[PDB]
């Protein structure tokens, strides 16, 4: 029913926030160590695939969210949550999955940074247009803006230092990379135990038919439609995979923050667990596709 414990005190969620921040820092450092700048500039030379993929994602994801909201008879708050979470730009999870499938990594990072930069302006545009009848207010000032630029800095700076280190001192990369890995492991366990401290009652939030169906389709719809549109426009196999997997994934932090700021906690009680569930589903799909992909290259 109501929020478990008291969210006002915020006992340990600061620790969860800082652990996630440091994990993103380490991941972006490793990713920057992975890639090279010349191929990034080459991708900037012909953004045709990148531009069409990005505009296709921003055109299909909000429309798919609106269609799901119309079909599954979600309430106003849940429909707004679907609309906001669906049209969010690509997060670091897509970059980690790109590590998993090791396909055209710098294209993935350029796509995610361009998606964030353009979403900074498209959030009011997409929210004002696609939310007629839900939240009659304009909500053009409730979209986070400091958070988006903070995320942009946190995704560019470690990549910048990694790409500078690799392009000038290529002999010390793997070593520090290995160190990052073990640190990740430690941070990883912290995450889960801290999630326990904030596990609450996620079963109460889960309304099986509508929520489960929306979660099942939306990342799957993104993956499938991105793959199909990449295949249609004559894209490379690595490009196809990375584009499909970037469009399928999204970001959940801004969705949660805007939901918190727009509505009082009592109205959005269970919805506080929606983004987390969203995350715990997309990964549950992501790795699964990887498990298929290896088989696709085994034969």
């Amino acid at each position: 029913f109501s929020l478990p414990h008291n969210f006002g005190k915020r006992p340990t969620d600061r620790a969860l926030s800082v652990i996630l921040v440091i994990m993103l820092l380490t991941i972006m450092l490793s990713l920057g160590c992975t890639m090279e700048f010349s191929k990034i500039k080459a991708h900037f030379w012909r953004p045709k695939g990148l531009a069409v993929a990005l505009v296709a994602q921003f055109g299909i994801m909000p429309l798919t969210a609106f269609g799901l909201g119309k079909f599954f008879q979600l309430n106003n708050v849940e429909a707004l949550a679907i609309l906001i979470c669906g049209c969010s730009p690509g997060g670091n999870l897509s970059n980690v999955f790109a590590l998993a499938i090791k396909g055209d990594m710098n294209l993935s990072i350029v796509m995610t940074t361009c998606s964030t930069f353009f979403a900074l302006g498209m959030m009011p545009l997409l929210l004002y247009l696609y939310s007629r009848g839900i939240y009659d207010g304009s909500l053009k000032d409730k979209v986070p803006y400091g958070g988006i630029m903070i995320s942009l800095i946190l995704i560019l700076i470690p990549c910048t230092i990694g790409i500078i280190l690799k392009s000038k001192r290529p002999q010390y990369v793997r070593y520090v990379t290995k160190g990052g890995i073990i640190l990740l492991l430690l941070c990883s366990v912290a995450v889960v135990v801290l999630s326990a401290i904030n596990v609450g009652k996620s079963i109460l939030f889960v309304m099986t038919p509508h929520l489960l169906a929306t979660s099942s389709l939306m990342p799957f719809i993104g993956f499938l439609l991105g793959y199909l549109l990449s295949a249609l426009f004559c894209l490379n196999g690595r490009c196809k995979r990375t584009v499909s997997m970037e469009t399928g994934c999204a970001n959940i932090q801004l969705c949660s923050t805007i939901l918190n700021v727009t509505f009082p906690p009592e109205v959005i009680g269970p919805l506080f667990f929606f983004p987390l569930l969203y995350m715990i589903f997309q990964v549950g799909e992501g790795l699964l596709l990887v498990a298929i992909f290896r088989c696709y290259e085994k034969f």
Partner: antibody, heavy 121, light 113 residues
């Protein structure tokens, strides 16, 4: 149960600058929004606008956009209305109503006692 | 905007004859996403604050008499009473909240002679 308290009857000269206070202590103030309804004597109800005390979000009707001004106070759990432009025809009964607001105001499930305002010399 | 009009605006029923208040609104104020049919039927006794009777144009607040009942969809709505009595003489407005909060003209109930 929840009840709404109004300031009471008020007489004011046509020089305007009048204030109305509606207090609500029966529930969590920020969870519900407060609408203001105007009723001239014998001409039916008329909506003015609502205020969300959580984010202080005020929405006004087109007719009352120029005159109406809605504010809220969390510490006192109250809502204030100011008009700052009164004529001899503005004498009417004003009600503050509480409505649930998920994304769209549902209905006025509880009303205030209503305060009568008169403008004359 | 949306404007609503109530047709009779005046009725006279003595003891048991059922009443029928209908306001046809202007546009289809029915939500396609959810079958809520945003509409509220209120009651205004003289010298008193309005009291809510029906919400979603089909359901009633707990505690109201069961004689009141409202049925409608799209733009056609109708409030009826199985048996009217002395304290049923009031004014009804059928407010809507689909797009903007607008009230109807109002229907007055009297006692016949």
């Amino acid at each position: 149960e929840v009840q709404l308290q109004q300031s009471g009857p008020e007489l004011v000269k046509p020089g305007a600058s009048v204030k109305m206070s509606c207090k609500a202590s029966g529930y969590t103030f920020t969870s519900y929004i407060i609408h203001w309804v105007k009723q001239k004597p014998g001409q039916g109800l008329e909506w003015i606008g609502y205020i969300n005390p959580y984010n202080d979000g005020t929405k006004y009707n087109e007719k009352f956009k120029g005159k109406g001004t809605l504010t809220s106070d969390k510490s006192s759990s109250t809502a204030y209305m100011e008009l700052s432009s009164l004529t001899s025809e503005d004498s009417a009964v004003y009600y503050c109503a509480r409505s649930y607001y998920d994304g769209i105001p549902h209905y006025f499930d509880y009303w205030g006692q209503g305060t009568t305002l008169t403008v004359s010399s | 905007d949306i404007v609503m009009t109530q047709s009779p605006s005046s009725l006279a029923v003595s003891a048991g004859e059922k009443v029928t208040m209908s306001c046809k609104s202007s546009q289809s104020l029915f939500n396609s996403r959810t079958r809520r049919n945003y509409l509220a039927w209120y009651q205004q006794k003289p010298g008193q604050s309005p009291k809510l009777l029906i919400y979603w144009a089909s359901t009633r607040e707990s505690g109201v008499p069961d004689r009141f009942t409202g049925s409608g969809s799209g733009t056609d709505f109708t409030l009826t009473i199985s048996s009217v009595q002395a304290e049923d003489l009031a004014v009804y407005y059928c407010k809507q909240s689909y797009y903007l909060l607008t009230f109807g003209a109002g229907t007055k109930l009297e006692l016949k002679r």
